[PDB]
Coordinates of C-alpha atoms and ligand atoms in Angstrom, one line a residue:
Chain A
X1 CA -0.7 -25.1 3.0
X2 CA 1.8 -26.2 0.5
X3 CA 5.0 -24.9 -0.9
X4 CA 4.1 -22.5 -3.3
X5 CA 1.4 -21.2 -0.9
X6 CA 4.2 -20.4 1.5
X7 CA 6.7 -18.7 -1.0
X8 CA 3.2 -16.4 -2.1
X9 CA 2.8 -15.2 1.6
X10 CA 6.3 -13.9 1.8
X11 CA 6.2 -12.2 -1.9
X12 CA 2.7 -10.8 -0.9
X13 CA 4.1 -9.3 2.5
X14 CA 6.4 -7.8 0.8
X15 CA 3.6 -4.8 -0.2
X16 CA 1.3 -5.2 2.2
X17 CA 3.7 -4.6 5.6
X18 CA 4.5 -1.0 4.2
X19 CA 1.0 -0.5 4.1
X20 CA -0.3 -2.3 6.6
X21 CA -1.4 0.9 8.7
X22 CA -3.5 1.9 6.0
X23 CA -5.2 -1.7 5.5
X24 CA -5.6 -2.5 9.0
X25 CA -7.3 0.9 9.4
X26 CA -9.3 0.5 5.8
X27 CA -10.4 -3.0 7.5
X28 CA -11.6 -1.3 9.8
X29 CA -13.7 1.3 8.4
X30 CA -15.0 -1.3 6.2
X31 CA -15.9 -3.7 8.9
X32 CA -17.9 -1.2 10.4
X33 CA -19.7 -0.4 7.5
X34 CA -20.2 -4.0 6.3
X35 CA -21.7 -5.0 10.1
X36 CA -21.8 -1.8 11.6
X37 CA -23.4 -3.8 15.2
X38 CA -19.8 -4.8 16.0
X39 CA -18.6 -2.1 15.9
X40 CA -19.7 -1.7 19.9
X41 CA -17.3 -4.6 20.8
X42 CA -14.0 -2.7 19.6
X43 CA -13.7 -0.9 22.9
X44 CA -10.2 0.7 22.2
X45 CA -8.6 3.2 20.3
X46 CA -9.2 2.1 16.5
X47 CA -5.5 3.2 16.1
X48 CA -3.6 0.5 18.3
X49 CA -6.4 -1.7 17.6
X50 CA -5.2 -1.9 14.2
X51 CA -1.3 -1.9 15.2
X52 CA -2.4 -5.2 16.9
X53 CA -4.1 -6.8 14.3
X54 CA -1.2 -6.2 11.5
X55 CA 1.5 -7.4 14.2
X56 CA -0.4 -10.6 14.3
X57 CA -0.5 -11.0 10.5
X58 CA 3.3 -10.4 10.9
X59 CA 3.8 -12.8 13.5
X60 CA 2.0 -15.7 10.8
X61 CA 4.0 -14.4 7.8
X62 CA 7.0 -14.5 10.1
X63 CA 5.7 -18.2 11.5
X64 CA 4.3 -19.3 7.8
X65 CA 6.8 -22.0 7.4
X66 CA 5.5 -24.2 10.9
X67 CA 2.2 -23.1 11.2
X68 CA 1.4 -25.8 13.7
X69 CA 4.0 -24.2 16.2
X70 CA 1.3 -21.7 16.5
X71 CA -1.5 -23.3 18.0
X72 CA -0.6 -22.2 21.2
X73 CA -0.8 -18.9 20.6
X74 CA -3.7 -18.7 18.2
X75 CA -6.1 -20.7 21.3
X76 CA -4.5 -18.2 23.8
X77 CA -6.0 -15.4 21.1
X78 CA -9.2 -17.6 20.9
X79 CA -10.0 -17.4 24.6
X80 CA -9.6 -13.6 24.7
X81 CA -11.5 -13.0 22.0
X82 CA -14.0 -15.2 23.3
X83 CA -14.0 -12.5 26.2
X84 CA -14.7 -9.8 24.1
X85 CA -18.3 -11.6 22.3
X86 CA -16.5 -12.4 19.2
X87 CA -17.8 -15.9 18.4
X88 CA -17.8 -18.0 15.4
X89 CA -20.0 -16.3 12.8
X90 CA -17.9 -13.2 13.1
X91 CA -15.0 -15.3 11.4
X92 CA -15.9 -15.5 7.9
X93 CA -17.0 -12.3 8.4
X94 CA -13.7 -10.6 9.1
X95 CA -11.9 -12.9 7.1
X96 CA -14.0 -11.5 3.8
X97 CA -13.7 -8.0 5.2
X98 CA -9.9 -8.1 5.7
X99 CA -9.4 -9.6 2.2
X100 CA -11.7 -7.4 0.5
X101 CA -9.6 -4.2 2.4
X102 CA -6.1 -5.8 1.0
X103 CA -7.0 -6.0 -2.2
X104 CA -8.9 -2.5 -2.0
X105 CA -5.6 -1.3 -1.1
X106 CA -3.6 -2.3 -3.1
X107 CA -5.3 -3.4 -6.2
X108 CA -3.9 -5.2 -9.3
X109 CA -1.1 -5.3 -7.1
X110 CA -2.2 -8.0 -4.7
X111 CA -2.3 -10.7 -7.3
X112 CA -5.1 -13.3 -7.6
X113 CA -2.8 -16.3 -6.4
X114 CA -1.9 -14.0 -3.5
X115 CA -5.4 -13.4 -2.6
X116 CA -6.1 -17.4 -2.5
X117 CA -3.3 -18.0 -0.4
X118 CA -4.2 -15.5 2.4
X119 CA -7.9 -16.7 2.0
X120 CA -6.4 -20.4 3.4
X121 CA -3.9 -18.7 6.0
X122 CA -7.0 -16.6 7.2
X123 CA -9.0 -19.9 7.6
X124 CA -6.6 -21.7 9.5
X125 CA -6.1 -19.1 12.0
X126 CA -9.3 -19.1 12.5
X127 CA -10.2 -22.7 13.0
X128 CA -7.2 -22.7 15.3
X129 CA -8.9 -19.6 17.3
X130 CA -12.4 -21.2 17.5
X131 CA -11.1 -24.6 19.6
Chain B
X1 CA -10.1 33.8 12.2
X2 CA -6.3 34.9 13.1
X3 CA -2.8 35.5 11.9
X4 CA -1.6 33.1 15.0
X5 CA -4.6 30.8 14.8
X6 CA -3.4 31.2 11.0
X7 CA 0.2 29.9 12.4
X8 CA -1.0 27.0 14.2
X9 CA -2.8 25.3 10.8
X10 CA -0.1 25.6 8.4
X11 CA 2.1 24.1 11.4
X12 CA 0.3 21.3 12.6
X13 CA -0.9 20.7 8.8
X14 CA 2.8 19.7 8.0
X15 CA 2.0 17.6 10.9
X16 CA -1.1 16.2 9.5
X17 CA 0.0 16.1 5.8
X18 CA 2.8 13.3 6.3
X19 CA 0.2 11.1 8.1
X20 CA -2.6 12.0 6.1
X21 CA -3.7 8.4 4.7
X22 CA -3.6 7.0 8.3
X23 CA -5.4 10.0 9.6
X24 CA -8.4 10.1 7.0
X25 CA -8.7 6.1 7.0
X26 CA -8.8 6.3 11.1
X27 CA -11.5 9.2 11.0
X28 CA -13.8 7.0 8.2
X29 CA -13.8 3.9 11.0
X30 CA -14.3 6.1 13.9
X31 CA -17.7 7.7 12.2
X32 CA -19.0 4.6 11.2
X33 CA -18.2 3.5 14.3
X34 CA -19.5 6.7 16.9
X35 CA -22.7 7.2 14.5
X36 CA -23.1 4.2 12.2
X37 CA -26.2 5.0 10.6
X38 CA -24.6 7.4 8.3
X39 CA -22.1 4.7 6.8
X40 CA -25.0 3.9 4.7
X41 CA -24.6 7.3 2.9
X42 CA -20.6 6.6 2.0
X43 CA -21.4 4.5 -0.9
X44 CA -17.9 4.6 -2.5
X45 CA -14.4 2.9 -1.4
X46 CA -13.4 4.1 1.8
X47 CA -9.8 4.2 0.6
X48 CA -10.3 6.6 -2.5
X49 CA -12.9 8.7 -0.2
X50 CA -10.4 9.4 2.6
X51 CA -7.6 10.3 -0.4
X52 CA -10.7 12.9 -1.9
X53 CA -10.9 14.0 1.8
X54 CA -7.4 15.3 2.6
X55 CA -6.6 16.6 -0.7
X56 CA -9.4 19.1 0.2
X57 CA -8.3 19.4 3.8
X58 CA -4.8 20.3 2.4
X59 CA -6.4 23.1 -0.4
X60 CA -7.6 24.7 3.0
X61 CA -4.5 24.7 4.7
X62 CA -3.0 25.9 1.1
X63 CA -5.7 28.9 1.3
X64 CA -5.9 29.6 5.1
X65 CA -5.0 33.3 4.5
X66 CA -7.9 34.3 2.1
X67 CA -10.9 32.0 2.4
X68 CA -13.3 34.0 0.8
X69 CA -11.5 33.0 -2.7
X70 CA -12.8 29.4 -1.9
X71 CA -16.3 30.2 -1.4
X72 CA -17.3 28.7 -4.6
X73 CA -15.8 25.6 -3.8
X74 CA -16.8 25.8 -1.0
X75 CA -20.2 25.7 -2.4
X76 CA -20.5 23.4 -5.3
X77 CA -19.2 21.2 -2.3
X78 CA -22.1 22.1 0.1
X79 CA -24.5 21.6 -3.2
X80 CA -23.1 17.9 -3.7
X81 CA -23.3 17.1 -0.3
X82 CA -27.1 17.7 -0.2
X83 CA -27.4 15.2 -3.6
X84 CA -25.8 13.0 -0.9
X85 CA -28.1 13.1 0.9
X86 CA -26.2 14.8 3.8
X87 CA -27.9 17.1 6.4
X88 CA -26.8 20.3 8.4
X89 CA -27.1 18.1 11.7
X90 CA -24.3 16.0 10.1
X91 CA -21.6 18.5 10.2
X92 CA -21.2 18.9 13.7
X93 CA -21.0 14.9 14.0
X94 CA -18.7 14.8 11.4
X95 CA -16.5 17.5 12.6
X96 CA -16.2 16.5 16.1
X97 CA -15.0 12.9 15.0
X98 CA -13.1 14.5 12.4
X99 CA -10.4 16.2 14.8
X100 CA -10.6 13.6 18.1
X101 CA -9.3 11.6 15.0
X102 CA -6.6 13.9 13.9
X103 CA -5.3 13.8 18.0
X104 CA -5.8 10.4 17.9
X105 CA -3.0 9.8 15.6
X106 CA -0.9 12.7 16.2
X107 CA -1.0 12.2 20.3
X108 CA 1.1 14.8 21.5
X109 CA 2.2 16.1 18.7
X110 CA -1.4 18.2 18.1
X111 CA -1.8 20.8 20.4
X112 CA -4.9 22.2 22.7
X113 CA -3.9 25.2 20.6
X114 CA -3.9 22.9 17.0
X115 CA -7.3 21.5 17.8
X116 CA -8.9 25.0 18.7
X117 CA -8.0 26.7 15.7
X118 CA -8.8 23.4 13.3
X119 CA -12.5 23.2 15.4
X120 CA -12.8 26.5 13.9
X121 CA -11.9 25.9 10.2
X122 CA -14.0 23.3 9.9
X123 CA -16.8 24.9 11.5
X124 CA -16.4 28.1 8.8
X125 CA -15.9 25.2 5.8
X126 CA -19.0 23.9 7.4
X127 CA -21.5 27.2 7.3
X128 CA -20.4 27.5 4.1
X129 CA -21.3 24.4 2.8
X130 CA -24.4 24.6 4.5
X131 CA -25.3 27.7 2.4
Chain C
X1 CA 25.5 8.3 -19.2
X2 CA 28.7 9.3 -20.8
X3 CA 29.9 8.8 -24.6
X4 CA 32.1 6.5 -23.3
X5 CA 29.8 4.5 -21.1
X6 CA 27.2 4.7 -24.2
X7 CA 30.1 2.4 -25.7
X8 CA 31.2 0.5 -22.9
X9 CA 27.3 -1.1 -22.9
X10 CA 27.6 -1.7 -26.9
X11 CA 30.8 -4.0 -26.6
X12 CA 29.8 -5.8 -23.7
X13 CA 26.3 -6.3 -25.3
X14 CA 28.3 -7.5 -28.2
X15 CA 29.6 -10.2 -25.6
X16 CA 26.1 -11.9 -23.7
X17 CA 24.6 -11.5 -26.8
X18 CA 25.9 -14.8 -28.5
X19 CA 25.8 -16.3 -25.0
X20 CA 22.6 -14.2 -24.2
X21 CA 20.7 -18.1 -23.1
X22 CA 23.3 -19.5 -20.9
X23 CA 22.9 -15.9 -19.7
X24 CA 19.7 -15.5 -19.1
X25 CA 19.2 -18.7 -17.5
X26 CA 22.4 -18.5 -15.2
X27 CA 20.6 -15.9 -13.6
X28 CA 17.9 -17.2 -12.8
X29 CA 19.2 -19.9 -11.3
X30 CA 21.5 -18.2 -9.5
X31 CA 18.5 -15.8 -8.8
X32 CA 16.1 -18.2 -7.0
X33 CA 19.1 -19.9 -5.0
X34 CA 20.1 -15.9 -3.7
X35 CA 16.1 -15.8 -3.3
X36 CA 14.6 -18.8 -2.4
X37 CA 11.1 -17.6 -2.4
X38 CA 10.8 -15.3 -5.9
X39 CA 10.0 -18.9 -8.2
X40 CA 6.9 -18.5 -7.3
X41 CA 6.2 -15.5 -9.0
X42 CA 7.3 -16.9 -11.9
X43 CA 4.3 -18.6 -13.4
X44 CA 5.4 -18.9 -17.2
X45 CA 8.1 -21.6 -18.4
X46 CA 11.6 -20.2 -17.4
X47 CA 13.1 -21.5 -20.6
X48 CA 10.8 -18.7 -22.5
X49 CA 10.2 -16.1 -19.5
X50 CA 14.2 -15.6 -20.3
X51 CA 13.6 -14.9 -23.8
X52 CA 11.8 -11.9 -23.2
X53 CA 14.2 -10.4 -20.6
X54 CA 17.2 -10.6 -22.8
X55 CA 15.0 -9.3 -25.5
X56 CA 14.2 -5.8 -23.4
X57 CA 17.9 -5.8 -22.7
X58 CA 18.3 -6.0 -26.6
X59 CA 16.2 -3.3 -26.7
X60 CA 18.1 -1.4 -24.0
X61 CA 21.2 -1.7 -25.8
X62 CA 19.4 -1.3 -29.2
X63 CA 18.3 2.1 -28.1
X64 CA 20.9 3.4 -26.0
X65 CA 22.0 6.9 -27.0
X66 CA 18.3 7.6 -26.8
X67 CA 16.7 6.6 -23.5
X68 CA 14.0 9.1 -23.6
X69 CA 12.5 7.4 -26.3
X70 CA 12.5 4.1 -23.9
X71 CA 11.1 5.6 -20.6
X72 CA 7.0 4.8 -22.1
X73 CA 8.2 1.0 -23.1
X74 CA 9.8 1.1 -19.4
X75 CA 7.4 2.7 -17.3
X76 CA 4.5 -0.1 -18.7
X77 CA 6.8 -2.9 -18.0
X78 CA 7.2 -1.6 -14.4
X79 CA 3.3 -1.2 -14.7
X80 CA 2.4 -4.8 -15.5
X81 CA 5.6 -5.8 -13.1
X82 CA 3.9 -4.1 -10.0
X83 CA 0.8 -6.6 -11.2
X84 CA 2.9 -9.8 -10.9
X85 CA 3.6 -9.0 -7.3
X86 CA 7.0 -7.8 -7.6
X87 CA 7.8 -4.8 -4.9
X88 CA 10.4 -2.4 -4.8
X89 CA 12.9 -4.5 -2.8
X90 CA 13.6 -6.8 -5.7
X91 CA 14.8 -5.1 -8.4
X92 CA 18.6 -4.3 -6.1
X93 CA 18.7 -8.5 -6.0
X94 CA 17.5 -8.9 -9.5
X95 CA 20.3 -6.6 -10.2
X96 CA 22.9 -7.3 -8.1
X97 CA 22.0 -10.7 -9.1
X98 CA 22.0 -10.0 -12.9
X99 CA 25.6 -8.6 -13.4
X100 CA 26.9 -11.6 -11.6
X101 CA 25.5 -13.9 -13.7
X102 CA 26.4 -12.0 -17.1
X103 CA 30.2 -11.9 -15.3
X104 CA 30.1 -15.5 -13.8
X105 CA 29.6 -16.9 -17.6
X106 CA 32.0 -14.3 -19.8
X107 CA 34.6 -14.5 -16.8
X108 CA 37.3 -12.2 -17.8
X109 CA 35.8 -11.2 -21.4
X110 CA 33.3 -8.4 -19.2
X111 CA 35.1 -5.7 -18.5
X112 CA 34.9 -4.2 -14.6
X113 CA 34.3 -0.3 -16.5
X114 CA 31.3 -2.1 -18.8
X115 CA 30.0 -4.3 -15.0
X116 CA 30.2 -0.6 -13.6
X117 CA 28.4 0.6 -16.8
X118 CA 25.7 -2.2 -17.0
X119 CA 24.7 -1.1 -13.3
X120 CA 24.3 2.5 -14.0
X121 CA 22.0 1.2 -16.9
X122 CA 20.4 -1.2 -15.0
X123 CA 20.1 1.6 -12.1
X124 CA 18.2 3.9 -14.4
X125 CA 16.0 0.8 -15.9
X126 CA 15.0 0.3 -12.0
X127 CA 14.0 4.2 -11.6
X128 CA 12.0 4.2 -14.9
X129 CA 10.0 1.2 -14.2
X130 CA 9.5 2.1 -10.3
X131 CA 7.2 5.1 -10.7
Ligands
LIG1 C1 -7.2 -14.4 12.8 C2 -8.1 -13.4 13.0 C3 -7.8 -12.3 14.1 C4 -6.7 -11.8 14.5 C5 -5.3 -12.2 14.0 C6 -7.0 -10.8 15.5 C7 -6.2 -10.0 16.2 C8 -6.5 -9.4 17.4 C9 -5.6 -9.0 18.5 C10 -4.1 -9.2 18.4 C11 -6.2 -8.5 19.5 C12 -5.5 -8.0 20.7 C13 -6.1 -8.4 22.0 C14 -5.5 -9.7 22.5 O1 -4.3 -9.7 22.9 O2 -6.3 -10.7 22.5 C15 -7.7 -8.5 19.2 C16 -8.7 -8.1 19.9 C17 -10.0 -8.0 19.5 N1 -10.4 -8.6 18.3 FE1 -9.4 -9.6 17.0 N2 -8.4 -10.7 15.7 C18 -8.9 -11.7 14.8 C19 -10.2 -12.0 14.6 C20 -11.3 -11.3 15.1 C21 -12.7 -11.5 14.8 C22 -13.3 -12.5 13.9 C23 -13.3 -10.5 15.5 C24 -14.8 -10.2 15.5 C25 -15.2 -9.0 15.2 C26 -12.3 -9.8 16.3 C27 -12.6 -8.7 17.1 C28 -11.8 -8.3 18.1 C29 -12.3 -7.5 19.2 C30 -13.8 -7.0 19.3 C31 -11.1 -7.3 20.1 C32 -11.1 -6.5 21.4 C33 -11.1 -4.9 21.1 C34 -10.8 -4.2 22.4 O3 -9.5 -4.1 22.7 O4 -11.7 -3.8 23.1 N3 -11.1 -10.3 16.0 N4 -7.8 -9.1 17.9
LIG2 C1 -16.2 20.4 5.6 C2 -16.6 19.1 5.8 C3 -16.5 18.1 4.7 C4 -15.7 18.0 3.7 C5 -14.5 18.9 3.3 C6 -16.1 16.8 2.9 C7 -15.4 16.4 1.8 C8 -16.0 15.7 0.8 C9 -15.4 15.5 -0.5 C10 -14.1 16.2 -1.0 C11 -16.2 14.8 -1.3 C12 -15.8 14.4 -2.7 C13 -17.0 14.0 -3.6 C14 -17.5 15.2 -4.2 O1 -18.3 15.9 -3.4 O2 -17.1 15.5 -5.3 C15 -17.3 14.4 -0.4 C16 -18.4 13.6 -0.7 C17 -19.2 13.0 0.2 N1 -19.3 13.5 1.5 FE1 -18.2 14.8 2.5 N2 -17.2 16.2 3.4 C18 -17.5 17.0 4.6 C19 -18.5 16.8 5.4 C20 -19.4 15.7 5.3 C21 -20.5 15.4 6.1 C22 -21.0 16.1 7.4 C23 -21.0 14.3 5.6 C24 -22.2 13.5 6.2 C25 -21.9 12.5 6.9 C26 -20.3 13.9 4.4 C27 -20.5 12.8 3.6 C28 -20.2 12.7 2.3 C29 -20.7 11.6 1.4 C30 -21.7 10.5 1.8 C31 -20.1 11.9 0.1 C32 -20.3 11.0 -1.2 C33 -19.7 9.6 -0.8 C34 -19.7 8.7 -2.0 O3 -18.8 8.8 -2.9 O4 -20.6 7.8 -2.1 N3 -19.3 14.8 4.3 N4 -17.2 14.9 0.8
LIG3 C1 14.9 -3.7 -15.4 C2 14.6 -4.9 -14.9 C3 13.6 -5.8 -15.6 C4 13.3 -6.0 -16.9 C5 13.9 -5.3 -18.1 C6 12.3 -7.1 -16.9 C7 11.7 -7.6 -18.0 C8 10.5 -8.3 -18.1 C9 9.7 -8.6 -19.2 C10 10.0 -8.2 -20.7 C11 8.7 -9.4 -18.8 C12 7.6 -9.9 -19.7 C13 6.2 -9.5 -19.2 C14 5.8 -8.3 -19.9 O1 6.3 -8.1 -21.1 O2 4.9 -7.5 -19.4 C15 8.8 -9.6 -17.4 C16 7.9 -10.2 -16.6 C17 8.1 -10.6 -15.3 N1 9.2 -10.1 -14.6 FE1 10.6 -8.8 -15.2 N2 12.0 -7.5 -15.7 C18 12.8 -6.7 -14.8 C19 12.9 -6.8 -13.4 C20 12.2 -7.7 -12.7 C21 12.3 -7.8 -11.2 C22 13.1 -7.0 -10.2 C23 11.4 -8.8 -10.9 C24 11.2 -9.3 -9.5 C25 11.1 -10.6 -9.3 C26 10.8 -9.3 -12.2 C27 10.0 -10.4 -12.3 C28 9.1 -10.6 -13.3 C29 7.9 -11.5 -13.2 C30 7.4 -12.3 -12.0 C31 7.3 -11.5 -14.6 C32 6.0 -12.2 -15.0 C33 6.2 -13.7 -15.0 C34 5.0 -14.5 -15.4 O3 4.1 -14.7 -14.6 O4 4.9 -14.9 -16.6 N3 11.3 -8.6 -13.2 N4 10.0 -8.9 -17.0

């Protein structure tokens, strides 16, 4: 992740944390559609589900600058979702889905730049969470 | 249907209205979620689909004194529906997810009372449709 | 927008015009420092991506006693604005930010009634182009 990649998540979170509710939640709907069989493994209230998942996205927009003084954090969220039968192929999978879901939501507005940017973030995370 | 169950909907819709993104977007994840053989038949984004839900959702609420003057609509609707390829035996499914998804948001703030009188819209909307 | 604020914007304008350059470059320098993270954003070259903002202020001025007639030209600009990635939340910097930079390079020759003037007129640019 380089400089200018850092400056786009900030702009980019600029629209997307006001409507994060409605992404999170249009993720989800849309993940259920897309691979409707995982839908078993989300065992809590979609609602807070989603509350969790934008807090996290948060937390890396907040964190963007030192990404590697997240690792600790992202393995701890490895392991539990380790627990819950996510495992690796489900990654690309949601990363597509949540990217898809962002810029259904917000449209022209989540510029194409933006979109590559979050695409690498996304990965990373991701690596990081599958040890 | 009556004038206090008439009350409770144009109350809690001013409830619902405000949140009504959240709401619809929550209620498309749950269905494809509870019974997700029927995602396959939502074929459109789920964002613009939930926005086409509520703004009918809301001409109830704006008509919840004289129903009968929304037959018609009611029907072209129900005709639509069936070129959808939805079924009578949907409706109940639907409706049932429908308002656990309007408490799930709302909590507390959607009464025994709220639910009651909405369970009964929906199922008149419903027969109507249904033709 | 008084008669006498409708003047007030012609004089000044008669000022940052023959600077209207130095002007439109101040600011952006002094923009990105206030902001470290908006040059990104900013994907043409800065030399020319000034031009055209102190050519819609030209037009601005150029137009003045007749606003109406600019809110189309406006409400597109906003439109392809909302496409670059800029959210709400900017426009108060790139204000704020513009009147100190037009006042930083005429000193004493920009009036504190045409700075209060250029904000109202900047205010109402910001409205126009916001939706
Ligand atoms: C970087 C990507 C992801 C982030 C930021 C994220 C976020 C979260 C968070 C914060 C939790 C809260 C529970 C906890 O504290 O561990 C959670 C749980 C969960 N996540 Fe993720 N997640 C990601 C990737 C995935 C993937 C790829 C899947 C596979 C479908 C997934 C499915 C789940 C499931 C099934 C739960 C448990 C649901 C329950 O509470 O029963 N997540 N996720
Ligand atoms: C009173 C209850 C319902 C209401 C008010 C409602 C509302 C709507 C509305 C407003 C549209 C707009 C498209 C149009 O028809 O012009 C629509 C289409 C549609 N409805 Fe419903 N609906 C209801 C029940 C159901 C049920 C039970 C199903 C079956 C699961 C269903 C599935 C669909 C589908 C699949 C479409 C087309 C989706 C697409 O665009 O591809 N709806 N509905
Ligand atoms: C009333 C205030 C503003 C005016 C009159 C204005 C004027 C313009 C004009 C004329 C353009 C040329 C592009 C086009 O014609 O579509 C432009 C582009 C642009 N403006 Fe503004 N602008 C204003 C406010 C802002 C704000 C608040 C931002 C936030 C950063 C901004 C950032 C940009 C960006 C990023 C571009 C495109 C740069 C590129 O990729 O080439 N402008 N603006």
């Amino acid at each position: 992740i380089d400089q200018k990649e850092k400056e786009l998540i900030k702009e980019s979170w600029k629209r997307i944390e006001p409507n994060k509710n409605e992404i999170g939640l249009l993720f989800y709907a849309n993940l259920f559609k897309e691979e409707p069989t995982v839908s078993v493994l989300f065992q809590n209230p979609i609602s807070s589900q989603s509350r969790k998942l934008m807090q996290v996205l948060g937390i890396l927009v907040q964190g963007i600058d030192n990404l590697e003084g997240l690792i600790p954090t992202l393995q701890d969220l490895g392991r539990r979702h380790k627990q819950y039968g996510v495992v690796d192929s489900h990654y690309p999978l949601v990363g597509d889905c949540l990217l898809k879901s962002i810029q259904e939501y917000l449209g022209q507005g989540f510029t194409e730049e933006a979109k590559a940017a979050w695409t690498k973030v996304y990965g990373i995370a991701a690596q990081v969470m599958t040890a």
